[model samples]
Target chain A: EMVRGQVFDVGPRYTNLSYIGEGAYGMVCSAYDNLNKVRVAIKKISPFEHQTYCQRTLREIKILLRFRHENIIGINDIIRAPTIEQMKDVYIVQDLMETDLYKLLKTQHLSNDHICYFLYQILRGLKYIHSANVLHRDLKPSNLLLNTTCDLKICDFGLARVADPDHDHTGFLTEYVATRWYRAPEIMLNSKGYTKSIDIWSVGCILAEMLSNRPIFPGKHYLDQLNHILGILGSPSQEDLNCIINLKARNYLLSLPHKNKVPWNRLFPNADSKALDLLDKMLTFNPHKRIEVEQALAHPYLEQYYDPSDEPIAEAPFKFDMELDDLPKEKLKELIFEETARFQ
Target chain B: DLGKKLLEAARAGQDDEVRILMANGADVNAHDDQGSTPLHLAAWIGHPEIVEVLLKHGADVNARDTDGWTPLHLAADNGHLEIVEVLLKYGADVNAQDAYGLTPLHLAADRGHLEIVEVLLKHGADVNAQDKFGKTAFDISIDNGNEDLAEILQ
Candidate 1:
């Protein structure tokens, strides 16, 4: 069930306000919600920076409430800025998590079982999201919220989209969506034909890092990230390189010094055979050939954890029809204030 | 070679490698290309355990980098509370200024780390400590909208 949201003053509602790091759209902080007697994360977003940024924030708010899963974050409430001058002070209150996956991975040691368990939750969530025809374009460790009991919930939806198969699914227009380190090959190459598989590649990188305790492909720049992936998986066949939308990128891949494919066993010698099998398919260079979320759920590594009942109900296809991407400043202001009044 | 090894290990937070280098007579006070000592990087990276190791081996607490920043300055600026405490326990000059005259308290307040500001104050940070621009730590907290830090400073 969706949490009934009320538009109210954020200052008096929450106490013990501690600054969390800034998100893409605004400043984030955690506060103890005195009214509910619970801790909540509050994001204060400035909506007038650009049309798309405002659109992305609105999309994030709308879509966040659409999912119901153990592994997805929930929206609690939104506190509207009282006046026009303070329109930059819009607040989004959400479930507060102790630490993100990136911070936790730094200090805490993860056993193989922990790696398997986390990956299971990640895919289980992915399966539900994909089944609902939505793509969480960004899935880096920082976006995954974790609690003390090792519970993981995926958060941050500014870059997520309701995948419309009929629309030009070529994602080159939104190239800056995912973090470079975990970005898929197609997205980096600026391919317009990218699909849901972009997220699978991200999961592959996260899985390897969980095991090694470091980013498997720590690419300094876009080209360097491509080179790093090539260095591990080796240069793809000419057929696969043609899949790249940008001509220069395809040529660059072909020009690189040939690197023989490194065997999964050699890279992760201590990882079990089943774990290696999943990584191989997920990290494939050709997005079409990449393993689907359901395929991953059925993999032997997650054999014991797989439960069909755990899958989230497929949500209706999201329609982001409002010209939020380029709405006029006055129109944008009007729409947002209308939203705030609606919440009240 | 030993100095280089100690610096690299400390930069990477490899405490074991730091200890081995110390045992092999590597100076904990060795300088790198950036004029930053091992303790400078250790404190900057918030490695309290490494800070503990370096201090136990008699590393200088007030060793300044090219920016005239001591280990305490780096720890406080980065909001590493435990590292700041460790440096303080080892007698870090709490009011020590960098080349720009910015004290550890000044950086912590400007960056809005309230807990770090409190620790610096507890260790006798001057409330009116100023940098090159004559901006006090309290002034910085107010300028940056750091309510919690400003309240305590006032």
Candidate 2:
């Protein structure tokens, strides 16, 4: 039996469904897309229970459709909410993976090759996104999707954006920060428009976790997160001092007890020398000096397996022309629906 | 077809779909494969709007599912205060017993839904009613270590 609505269709063609999990934006369910003759996960951006959520739904749809890469999660089809009311329920159909790296890392004992290849794939994917001039504001184990065969794809673009280097979004960007554990220091300090290198800081943390089987720095709060970083990487340099725009935050950082940098050998004694070198560069205290995605790909850690096929094509960088952050609900809806129509 | 669709729509919290099905002659008291009516599923799912829609379409406010669970029983179990209020406004039997002799208050207290327990009591539910297991709302609350709910039941 099929259940249909004027605004949305739920039970037709897609059958044998089971809910997998939920996120800030929507609930994810596993379903069989009989039309495509394959199983796929459907992210149901349910009824517009709130206005701001629609903004995230729209941005994710926009970026996923625009950027296509093997290392990145691919968008299969978008089931648009045919009408305005139905539009409240947007569905983004995507590739289904058995588990995310967050769960997989806990269950499996990964080999050196697994660690090397996984990081390579992530950089390749990040290379594609960074080449497009977008920043994946959020990246962590949970966001890194994986299959049984160990192929990885980055998902969850709800927090991704076309970052403009010249524009200072610190005013509003401060309102939305990455999850505490994976958040970059620049983001925690509420610094000005951070560049593409902010993601490298997150990659450094993930790599450390993969080797040690625990989060390198699990901060309890924002201040604790800063402390966690300082406790390991030691205090930021004098140049990083000027990056703190919030005076109170600056004062707190100034007041913290001195912490010496922990030697990388103590942290990951078993990690290869090349891997250690890459980690040191990626985890640089200053965002400007942090290892860029392109540089990390050339690091000797991936020398044995690096392929030109892994290189990102130099596509025209994505331009963010819309002042979308503060758009009213009606305008946001109109623009989003129009964008969907454009791609269709 | 309409009845099955109404059940599915209400279960999924599709209030408008429930409305469309009801307007097109779907039975408001339609049962599913498990003998759950639209009211049972809607109340259990905590969609007050769909419950309102089904009730306005002349649904039996106290219709029982296979478990002898009335719409009020399911609403109380799900802890939706507004849905319980609307069901009662439509003349729900707040003290109605299920197959286990559990009233809405019994289910509400056992589930630790304090607000629902309060509303059910205020609506004149029999606070002392026991199920086949001989447990009152107060008895169940205390046994489950829900002191806040147990005190309120008291």
Candidate 3:
């Protein structure tokens, strides 16, 4: 039994379940794994409810299975329906974290070391992800899970996609809501293209939020999102403006009043110079000029923990071949079922 | 530092700078932090001239990036037919699989690069080769609704 009319079809392997939170695609709850003797987070996903949800669930499951990093969430077990006919819901079990960075930011007081260590872990996980040619397109504080010991793991791959080796843009043409605050200017400007630098921009936003104890760019709407960014970073240069591919977005940007770039020192007067230096590079308006994950790892801000040997790359690129197909609901269900069956 | 410059020049299609860096004793096969060689960047960015320069400087045609992508993989995927032909001429492995077990043929067919697919086949690419998902080049073409590519692959 579950709240919100959701049914928990997870087998008799768990007990004493408590509701945690609901994600856009699924409802998550905490459960005790009798077999493993550890508390785990169980996500009940009704993937077939919508075509988009089905595709996202399939992609997330496939990615989580392939990715195995200490800083990236790992799937402990996938409980599939006993029969395909009854497989209306899929349950994914993972290690339970006390809270997410989003909730923790409001309650906890972080020191310089905590900020440095957390940023290092994020970049460390991102290095492995970028090496695999995969982009966690929906990176935000909520997606970063944290524990009492200060261990942070990046979760939520429903919006992640494999990078196109040939093109800088993604296959998706539509904009995602709710993540507008952390989106890169190129993405917001409808630049018709983006690269791994989008994730770097999100990292910059997260760092700024950690420093100021609130979101730096809390936009009310899409246009406002751009305004919030421009207000802080100032106006884009003609050279950087040329990078915008959408005529409407480009013209709209040109019509706006010019703004002067804000000084980083003014925003974070008490912050370390090294942290501000990295933030400046990460928050660059031009995607091409943004600091790469590897470069960020090597920055002096993380010099205490920077070690080439410690940073690892994924063994192979995570490719979901089905992404190119306009797959139907049933076909996607079959594929997702096949994937989960591999774990069993 | 010179090797990094060579990679940048290759990516930006600056053949002259690439040549200069090579002449200055840069490692043609030098990889960046992600293990991408100058040849990989040149092939990926569609710079046939830079690709040739790197190859002439003894760049490894079959060099694998962090993701196990060869120069041929990028060239075929991006539909750079000239780069593909040049890479094949330089003895690039037509069937070299990336980390996902995707060969140049799989990528070319998936993207409906008919000419690149034909070039790869002529260069000894396995038409029936399967990726990690057990999908063949022909299977990929059909899934992508690439009827023309499927016919050729078949």
Candidate 4:
């Protein structure tokens, strides 16, 4: 088998071949929820190998308990299991999602309307999490899951934290939190402390990918990553680079060719004026210039993708090739049913 | 002039004149238009003597007239150790939260005042009592790299 089928039983005693992902704790496998006969993703954090794995897993449980929204991944439950050895081991169960948005986009062509719909869902989900003062520090195409139905869910709360509510966010500092491909300029330029702007930067990359039919930055190394960034956006000004808290990039301020064009309008030629405005703000070289999530939600570009019917369907110009008509009834049912069996 | 006189007497830690003014029918808890009572001015100026005098005269220890802050919170916020000790001695509830759910201990810990924190801890403050952000005062100190406070916590 090419590993598409579910692992019938996955626990201490039962073994199966389908592995979903891996991390410091251990490997996660696709396990069958025996009672429901549905598949769930079970992350087995080995107490024997890594001591703090259980605590980190418990942190995941705490985060899930606090956040519940349609766009964010739902953590079904976690079990210490009944076995004596397993008492030390923790099993985190979550909805098994189908291919991620990245994979789906790879397999098929996405219409501009389809792109807008996904972006709208992303914004709605981001807005919901940010409102509760949560920051999804790690956001990428791979982390944004796509179920059988194709609806998106922001998964992996491993690095997420409630933005410094009790702590003064003003003085706090962290360097290079985002995955490199989607890293923000503030992070790229090394801002002392970053907020939710990092996530929007990734979304901007996705926006660029959707517009140009490729990733904006396909760097395989750190130097390439910086080069890719400066190539598209002009070099950071002295004042802007000063704002980069602890920028390690050797060429962080290295001169790069500045193509004189309204890059926002070019990157998103089909995007509405409101969305264009939003993209321009989100892709700002200065972190301070970037629009906040709350402000982004109210932007006209994102609001354009809203469906008044409650159920999303096809619309045109305002929507394009992929509209409500693209996702038919059966296609959605298949996706949802598949998701119920996939571990998110 | 009257407000300044009362405020000066409080800030100077003079318990006698404050009592005399109150006995002579001046409002014991009289606040200026800004709702700053003698207690507020006293704590703000680190006048522990005035705080004691005001509290003895039945001044509201937790009075947050308009800005929702008691003298104790303000004292801790500024790390006024003497004023903090005096406020607690006068029955200032260590756990009394402001509108921000920040107790005086939280304010002290955030500001890295180990002395104020020790005083608050002696008065039955919850060392692990979490604020609205699900973090305890101890956690706040630890996050700020106040290793001395973190070490003492252990």
| TM-score of chain B in each prediction | 0.96, 0.93, 0.97, 0.81
| lDDT per residue as tens, model 2, A38-113 | 8889777763554556667677777887888888897887767666655666777789998888997898767888
Output DockQ, candidate 2. Answer: 0.02
Candidate DockQ values, in order, are: 0.03, 0.02, 0.01, 0.01
lDDT digits (tens) for residues A1-344 of candidate 3: 66667787666898888888896676888989999999899998887866677878888898899899999999889988867788888889999988889998899757888899999999999999898888887789999999989899999887787877554345442222244688787765545546788899999999998887889998633455777899989999999888777776677788878999999999899888999999999999988999999999999999999998989999878653446347888888888889899757
Q: List candidate 4 stretches off by more than 4 Å.
A: A1-26, A47-55, A81-86, A165-179, A245-262, A267-274, A305-344, B1-154
User: Which 10-residue span in candidate 1 chain A carries the lowest summed lDDT?
Assistant: A1-10
TM of each candidate vs. truth: 0.67, 0.65, 0.67, 0.53
Clashing pairs in 3: none
The 10-residue segment of model 2 chain A with minimum total lDDT is: A170-179
| lDDT score of residue B102 within candidate 3 | 80
| Tens digit per residue, CA lDDT, model 1, B93-136 | 99998776788888777656778888999989998876654578
How many clashes does each candidate structure show, in the order listed?
A: 1, 0, 0, 17
Q: What lDDT score goes with residue B61 in model 1?
A: 93
- The local distance difference test score of model 1 is 0.78
Q: What is the lDDT of residue A216 in candidate 4?
A: 78
- Write down the RMSD of candidate 2 (Cα, Å): 16.6
Candidate number achieving the greatest lDDT relative to the actual structure: 3
TM-score of chain A of 3: 0.94
lDDT of 4: 0.64
DockQ of the two-chain complex in candidate 3: 0.01
Distance from true location, Cα of B58 in model 2, Å: 52
* Local accuracy of candidate 4 as per-residue lDDT tens digits, B1-154: 4545676677566778876776665565777776778898788777777777778878888787454668987798776898888788778888877654667777777666788888998898888776544457876654554556677666
* Candidate 3 chain B, run of 10 with poorest lDDT: B139-148
Model 1 spans > 4 angstroms off: A1-11, A82-86, A166-179, A319-323, A338-342, B5-154
lDDT: worst 10-residue window of model 4 chain A? A316-325
